[PDB]
Design a protein around this nucleic acid. Sequence first.
RNA 1: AACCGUAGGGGAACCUGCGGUU
RNA 2: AACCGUAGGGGAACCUGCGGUU
Length: 233
Amino acid sequence: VSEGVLKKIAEELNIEEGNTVVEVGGGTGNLTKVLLQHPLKKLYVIELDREMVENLKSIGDERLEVINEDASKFPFCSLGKELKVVGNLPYNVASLIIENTVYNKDCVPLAVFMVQKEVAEKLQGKKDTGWLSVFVRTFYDVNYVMTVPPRFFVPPPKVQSAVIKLVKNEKFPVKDLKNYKKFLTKIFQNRRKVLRKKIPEELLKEAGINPDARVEQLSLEDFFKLYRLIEDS
RNA sequence: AACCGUAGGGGAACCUGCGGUU
RNA sequence: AACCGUAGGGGAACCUGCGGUU
């Protein structure tokens, strides 16, 4: 019964007069249907399928703009100055869409996704993390919206996915995001090794971080403290 | 930036060892 | 055998360093 669940997602977006809203990763149809019931301005569906895009021939309201490219490698700031990305995220490429969206932090203050409880709990921080989580929480706040049991989907799957809300909250200023990504990949590479091995000790000692500690024991402010030293000062 | 080659990261499909339940 | 847990095997997107070509 997607009826109920799809409404809750639009409700959470808070759509007003001058709102541009981009849907990512369709493949169902009814996603746009329920969104177009809200006071929109411009709506863009990003759908990978060349057959699904042709299903714009449902009602064909001239206030849409379906864009046939892929959501995981798209530049969002090409569209608008303040965007509200929404989308049910497929389990396989879910990571890439989130990485992709944060890159456009400047032109997207709010984003709401249907991911997967494990993928979501990882992103939150509380239950232990990966680099992608740190990348997100650097520029956004992840918020648990609601759980969805394996019945509200087309079939009943093996996972119980959850809805997440991402409100913009840049924690510390960062000039090059790719530079910053490369940094996190360098720290998270080979998780179980001591920090000292991965990064020059002269800088671990600089921060409050014990060099013989592990990358898991770190927490946001730790990641900031030493990055501000990495690109120098 | 794209694309070859190259070195890693990554971590889906599937495969198996052990344990719990039917 | 199936499902959950657990230890690996395996390695799809995709990212990155270096080199070449545009």
